[PDB]
Symmetry: D3
């Protein structure tokens, strides 16, 4: 499912304030990460990244590709491909606890200025 | 070279049933893999993926990046970027024989059901 | 920041002939590389690619992800996400000098021949 | 810092029985891992493995090489090169919890049976 | 097991002349690859190399670490840590077939001359 | 060639003080990286490391394995496998120039102090 900026904004309300990051920072980050596509999937030779936040199967979730993954989010990666972002949000909180919002390079690279444009009326 | 659901459907007829996988499954998988673009190419720091099936150059084919690739499909990777999908299919059959359809994670994740929407009637 | 074939053609003028490569080849390559988007950023498990030319943080530039980067172009990777392609071109000349145009597989695979459609007149 | 087959038994006591793995298995596994050298360090192009258990800087601990490591064990990797194996063991227990003893391929491979030679 | 140069020269007799490479070249190559240790194993974040020839689990054999390995040699990697080098040899031929002796960089760099010192 | 501490100490004189690192530090680091084996070669899936200093074919030199290496030292990797440490040092200087001594993780943790055992009163 390809969401609209305002839709992402709404759906991510649960992440508001987590780790102190605001929604415009989240909307901007996910835009540069998956272009707002909940079904985004990229398979490389060693790993595959899943969904809206492009979570990878080497550390966060379990795959057919990496069954020996640390699976920090204790979930099967494909659960990140459907339309209910509940699972994504749960795992993302785990990532923020372990590495921080800057785990995503796009946050600092493209989301530290002109933040008002990522806002929703 | 961008294709549509039914052109992919028509051109992958030879994979139909091969190894026990159905056509809608393939149409679905290639969609989530390359969005039906025969010239899709993704270069990473140490591996690059080619064509409609995004075949990588570490194992299946050879290119200047990984000259020591196992090159199981015995072909130069750029043959996967033309519009003739014959070379591609030969290789895919080799991948299926060795690893199976779920070698493509998108298949297991998004193309193992509800395939009805990947259908093209009259073939 | 999505350019058009001809804007790219215009902006990369300083690369013309460099390393013996013609502009139509440059236009073709960046099209297959970033789709002409000066802000393309692809983050993988341990490397991230930046901008029009998708320059990576393991060798050419400095990231928060790879601080021990050889950083051949002596620059922080995010300078490749702005609209000013000056940084990018300076770095691309470096890459050309060190490895060559075929460092980009898209060039060899698709942009060394049948260049007519990449012409901009 | 080189331990002998017997010191290892002593030092890894806290691991005994944890995750179902016995000491002789650990003695065997760590032998194939680091030769009982607690300062063992293998640096590759992208990853680096530290200490007796050869814990990597990509997932388990934080490095200068990999500052964005998920750092699951919440610790700086060089604390695995000291002679206090307390922090090592604590991290190993997390790996066991999250992945299991077979995360170490040498275990399943060479330290599954004939565990007699690994006694002290 | 830790073979000697002579023990290796004997057990790799089957590779004699395959793909055109001589026994000394093979002895030299394995020397620089594993020091003749048939139980040599090196696990990294993404792959693991096994045995005398340090065969990796991403392409040649089936692992717990890499179950989607193309498994070209249709064999589980642990079989490369046995003292019986028959499997190792079967797989090495496949590698010579798909890639060539120079798949091992040590061969081209160190085992292409001054070979008489690898004779037995 | 398997050298002794002092043979290595001797051969790396040009590196004395380069980038601020003393010989005792180098003699310690190279022992931890290659065991003083000038012919050490470690081949992995994606890269290989060569010689005394274990320089890789991903960034510093050119290989048949990685022909598209950035090849910063502008040298073919196997030149790092012989007895003459001259190219090795030339390249180590470039690495020190680009990334620094702590490019070698063993240095920081094991070869920064308590170096009595690594001196040579030659």
């Amino acid at each position: 499912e390809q969401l609209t900026k305002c839709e992402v904004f709404r759906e991510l309300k649960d992440l508001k304030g987590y780790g102190g990051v605001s929604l415009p920072e989240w909307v901007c980050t996910t835009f540069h990460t998956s272009g707002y596509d909940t079904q985004a999937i990229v398979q490389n030779n060693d790993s595959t990244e899943y969904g809206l936040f492009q979570i990878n199967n080497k550390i966060w979730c379990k795959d057919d590709q990496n069954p020996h993954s640390s699976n920090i989010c204790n979930i099967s990666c494909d659960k990140f491909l459907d339309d209910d972002l509940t699972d994504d949000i749960m795992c993302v909180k785990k990532i923020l606890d372990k590495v921080g919002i800057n785990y995503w390079l796009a946050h600092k690279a493209l989301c530290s200025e002109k933040l008002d444009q990522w806002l929703c009326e």
